[PDB]
Amino acid sequence: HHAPSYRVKRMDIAKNDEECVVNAANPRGLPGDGVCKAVYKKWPESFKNSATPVGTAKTVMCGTYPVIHAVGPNFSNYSESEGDRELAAAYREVAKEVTRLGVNSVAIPLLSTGVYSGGKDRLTQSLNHLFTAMDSTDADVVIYCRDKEWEKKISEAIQMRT
Numbered sequence: 001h002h003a004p005s006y007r008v009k010r011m012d013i014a015k016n017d018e019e020c021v022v023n024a025a026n027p028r029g030l031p032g033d034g035v036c037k038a039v040y041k042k043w044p045e046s047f048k049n050s051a052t053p054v055g056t057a058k059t060v061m062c063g064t065y066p067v068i069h070a071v072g073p074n075f076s077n078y079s080e081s082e083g084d085r086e087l088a089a090a091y092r093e094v095a096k097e098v099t100r101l102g103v104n105s106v107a108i109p110l111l112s113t114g115v116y117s118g119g120k121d122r123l124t125q126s127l128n129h130l131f132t133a134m135d136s137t138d139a140d141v142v143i144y145c146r147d148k149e150w151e152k153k154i155s156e157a158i159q160m161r162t
């Protein structure tokens, strides 16, 4: 039946229309800047016992609504090699949680492309790991970003696969 899809939206992920949200989290469950700022603004109870290791994800239910805290590596602290593995792992744990949760859709940002980027442009790296994990799930995936140029590039990368 229903065709699982990938979409990109340039808007605040906290305003998503999907059955769940992925927070670009930190490992201590602390409020922060960027995605986590918006997620904390809307779902602060989701931060109750959300602390989890780098490269893992941990879901906290806000009623019927899952907030998947996914912890990408900070590339200021991780080497390129070790960070690539942790980033891959975070997105794989996202896919496992999404499947487990039985959700029909998910709102997701590009992990480790903002305050955890170590100053590097990691759009293509983060998206590649996103695809590698998500591709085997049948949930509709909606990627959120804030930059116009990044929206275009993410959109192209989706479109050219098919």
Ligand SMILES: Nc1ncnc2c1ncn2[C@@H]1O[C@H](COP(=O)(O)OP(=O)(O)OC[C@H]2O[C@@H](O)[C@H](O)[C@@H]2O)[C@@H](O)[C@H]1O
Pocket: 011, 012, 013, 014, 024, 025, 026, 030, 031, 032, 033, 034, 035, 036, 037, 038, 072, 109, 110, 111, 112, 113, 114, 115, 116, 117, 144, 145, 146, 147
């Ligand atoms: N409200 C938002 N909606 C959509 N996209 C956003 C939003 N805020 C930021 N972005 C974009 O989402 C991407 C992820 O950036 P971050 O949220 O900074 O996540 P990350 O790079 O994984 O760093 C996580 C760290 O940031 C802290 O705020 C958080 O507590 C953790 O310490 C970046 O490309 C960023 O430009």
